């Protein structure tokens, strides 16, 4: 572990074309010296593995502005106007991989492991490939994603993977001791925990350094083996980007999701709907809420005074946690998706299939890519339910035969909750049809779904809490 | 998360025939209460997915006594000798399986990831199949492995394997908090922590539980999600299998030892091997820091404990009780192998029965004798990034060669090792060249090496006498 005073000493040695992986999280644990350095050495044709792709102003999308990316691989690069704007001029290059595939990848690279399936982006086009990595100035394509190869173990598809490494890895964290050893705070953690052990130098820029001695040795978040080039920053900005503080139909299908929790339940809930049935949860029940930026124990929105830039949810928002939350790494977030420890998953969606295939994730000719919504749909073990709006304007049907927009997942919807009516949902006997919102009638319901389904037999009027 | 008073109750429906992850290396972090348990309620025809095999009276071997378990997969199940007559007499089925693809299988049953490649195996029973399973009355194997499927990546061969999920985990942790966060203590996180999360009903003993608040959210190790029953076990023997206290043919050993102790530097990250590598730790010069790491998850070992500080927690990977330096970590053997699979270990120093002309390493079985496992072994010298050292006497008994031209032993690794120290000789071991002798005990000519070498090998014109710290 060297130790240096000069963020431009620390990165000096980066060559043109290097892959760098980047920490952070929205603007959540950025290492926001050591990417000024980049920008006062001015290195450039960088491929930067990075969850997103920052704001305009901020984080990675500072490199962005000065050009200095040939490529970036990341998850979620939505919220900076300027990436949208060299993707489509066929000046940057982008590909976009599942957020949990992502965090695998860069683990896979760090622990030796070249390659590994997992079931997040079957049936969708992550494993089909083709799609627009780079255009030239035609809008014709410079370069097409590679598929994926598809694979079965015990009954369910899986696709192929391949490890991400880098050159160097710019990582922020919380604190160092004089060893090396680096701790992270709340959930800046996300990604710099990963991408410390997946690149040949790891850079780490932290708060403040402290003696050998100060971190219990069981509490060590990246042991000092991993921890190359350290140095304490001299300035954070660190700037939330949401400071988030504490219709009839939507109302509906909120107060029915609300009936989805049960004591003693995991769930990982969308923005939106999602979110907002969770204030309809009785306080004589316990719901654990996970975050896929590594936080299990999420509580309600900040005070004022309680808003951290370290403490976010996965819509970027400020949050808070409860008594007895806990806090871990990106790759640890989506094994504890993957592995299907998660009981409930609730989200939104723009189609569901009769037979549960979702698109909620991309519109052709509308670019943002998928997050974790393909990790979160790609467990059996995990209850799905999809809360949406029944119809489309002019009546254009949502649920459908075969969806006709990208797929999330394939055969992943347990459950459809609308303002009509909620339908459970089978990968091979299609859609049965258990509640009904009082007032209409099943050819009500008909006449707005695209496909056939079967009518409970218990079949009762649409709950509401 | 469940709690309960009774631990009996807790494992209660656990059927014959269950797949039963056991957490534990050596002695350490074992769930003694939750095996105590098995034993009352006599579940038997298990499948015990266990590092070790315990000792005799503790451990997984009390459940060996008892005949309950009819399958292992560990990686190392010596030091019971109820064990080996089981094994043996063709009563237990055995999978030896590296110690670090045990791990990482075990963390991919956790994290939803069915199968992945690792290059540990390359080139040995592991990947060409037959490694004995189950042995007939008479001795002869019937139950062999089978061959692993083996695929190239960058140049480099790679053996798949799949996830390993349990029915049932037994998992001791160090404390829970009333949400049931759980925290590990020492070394005794090991396997405990992965298994925690690859079973459908996870079963955690813990020595206290405290209040929700009493772990930051950052320190909590498996989070509450993870843990489905949870007991305070009422009592804890916590043995120490081998107490190792600060203080025959050692007059060529202490030759090899302060010559492989001027193979550490400065700044060096090492894993030293159980025999000879141990002692040359002794000799690194006090005007360096070399951090040692532990397969089984410490890196910053430090010497050998005084009475009052040996802790049943705290173990090196020869189940020797250690201490720790200050600015030393613990981790879990997932992480642990995570480290020396990913090449961050800067040198590996192991000893051998066998060393071949072009690297190939032969230290973890010797065919009708010794069949124990290979633990760590082969994940060990499975990195390309990482050096590997062999140091060991020069010939066996009768002057038997022990560097040939091809190892007669079941190979740990194909073409890993990179210098060869003996009490005669230092070799450059080269995977095209073959070996060149750059280093020759003095008042030996090279005659004397040749001799006792099974094949040729070239002598450095830069030719010196064996080097000895000072």
Redo the contacts between chains.
Sequence with gaps: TKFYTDPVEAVKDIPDGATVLVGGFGLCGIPENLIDALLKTGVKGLTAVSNNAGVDNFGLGLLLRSKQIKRMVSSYVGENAEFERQYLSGELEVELTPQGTLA?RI?????????????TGYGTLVQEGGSPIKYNKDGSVAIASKPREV?E??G?H?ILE?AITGDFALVKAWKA???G?V????SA?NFNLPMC?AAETTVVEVEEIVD??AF??????I????VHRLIKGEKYEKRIERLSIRDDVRERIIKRAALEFEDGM?ANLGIGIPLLASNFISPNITV?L?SENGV??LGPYPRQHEADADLINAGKETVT?L??????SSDES?????????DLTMLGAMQVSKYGDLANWMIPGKVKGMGGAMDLV??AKTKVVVTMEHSAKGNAHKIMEKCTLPLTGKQCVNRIITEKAVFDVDKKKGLTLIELWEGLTVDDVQKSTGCDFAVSPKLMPMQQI
Excluded at 216 to 221: F, G
Excluded at 223 to 226: L, R
Excluded at 323 to 328: C, D, E, H, I, V
Aim: glycine share 12%; no cysteine; hydrophobic share 35%.
């Design positions: 695998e683990r896979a690279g760090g622990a030796g492991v070249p390659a590994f399936y997992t079931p694979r173990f015990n369910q899986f391949e001791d004089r060893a050893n701790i992270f705070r709340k953690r052990k050998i001695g219990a040795p069981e509490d060590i978040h042991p000092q083996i991993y995991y654990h996970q299990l124990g946690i008594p007895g939350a806990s806090f871990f989506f094994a504890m998706i993957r592995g299907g420890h998660v790609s467990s």
